[PDB]
Symmetry: none
Subunit: 227 residues, 2 copies
Amino acid sequence: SPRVLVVDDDSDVLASLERGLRLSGFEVATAVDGAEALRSATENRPDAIVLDINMPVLDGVSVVTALRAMDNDVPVCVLSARSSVDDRVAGLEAGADDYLVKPFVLAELVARVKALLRRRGSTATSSSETITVGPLEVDIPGRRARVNGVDVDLTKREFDLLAVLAEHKTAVLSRAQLLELVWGYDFAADTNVVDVFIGYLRRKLEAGGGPRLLHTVRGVGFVLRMQ
Amino acid sequence: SPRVLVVDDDSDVLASLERGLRLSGFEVATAVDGAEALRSATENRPDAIVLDINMPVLDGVSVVTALRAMDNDVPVCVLSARVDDRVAGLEAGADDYLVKPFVLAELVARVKALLRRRGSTATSSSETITVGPLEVDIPGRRARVNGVDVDLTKREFDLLAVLAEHKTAVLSRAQLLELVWGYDFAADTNVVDVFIGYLRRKLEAGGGPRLLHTVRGVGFVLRMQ
Ligand SMILES: [Ca+2]
Ligand SMILES: [Ca+2]
């Protein structure tokens, strides 16, 4: 009953993923390149999209870029070959919500797709008032972050992360807690998605040129706090 | 401003490159050896790296090797020497080179070219291109000859990919410099001819037929026969 659009230009992989997800309980639509992805996404509006990065015609990065420019927040998990790192990172930066490296076992994708759906248009936060951490203001309801009055341009998943960290300002959250609260994971994962997104957030928070607000507590977790 | 990391163990040269590139409109990071180069590259994600070859602690060839081994496709222009007539940094995976001594205008032109290429979002509609025994998987950035992987550096593939996309077309040195290297300017560099050599040698390793042809005074063509 959730509709998942799966996009890959490798016809074996696409057929396999189609088979795998349909059997796992999803209504599945497919596309072979990013143009067909955007057509499919536009004409059918999937609940989630599984999106290969390196494709002809329009790549996965472009597809993501395009969706997000249209304010289309559909959850997206990008797929990439192992070696195609600085590149899957591009999809995440451009606005994908999660990634999975090939080859993967099908359970890894199903689990992340159910998480994607659990956390589509998101946060597990109750704050209504804007949250201040030094010069940073995190407006959860208005989905707006500002540092010294200047908006910080964040993707939907960067913002969800910052929002969870602001909701628990000054508290340390572990990778595992952040996978559950932000990504909606209900399973143990081998993933550095939290680390990658902490990198992006911190770079954005610091681009102005002042204090580190977002701290890595080695072996324990991450914390948003002034000083 | 594009961020360029410059790496040279000679502090005079390092300082001079830094000054020059900054006055040319670049945001410049520096590193004194290959170890500092790796740290800077990780901590600071430069848009391009100007990389000396002979350095203590860790050399330019080792830097390029480590970067490529770690799937970091950052543009690298190596500052290298030229005997063997080999340019070891290129073979290791650097994208272009300059031979010291050089004028700054040559480095600036080459760094802009690096950046032009890395900045390109042009996406081909081609999938796998077949030329006789050779298959070029464009989107997958893989080549195989008679089903056997040909291990190519990023820039070797870039060149192979342009030749395959225009398969059987003769592309001049000038067009490949523009198309593959991102040059917008004159350049008397031999970099295209050097990489053609690399590809031939790699493509022809399995004993097979010549697929990459040099038409002197005209250009280069990838075709079976
Ligand atoms: Ca692909
Ligand atoms: Ca040196």
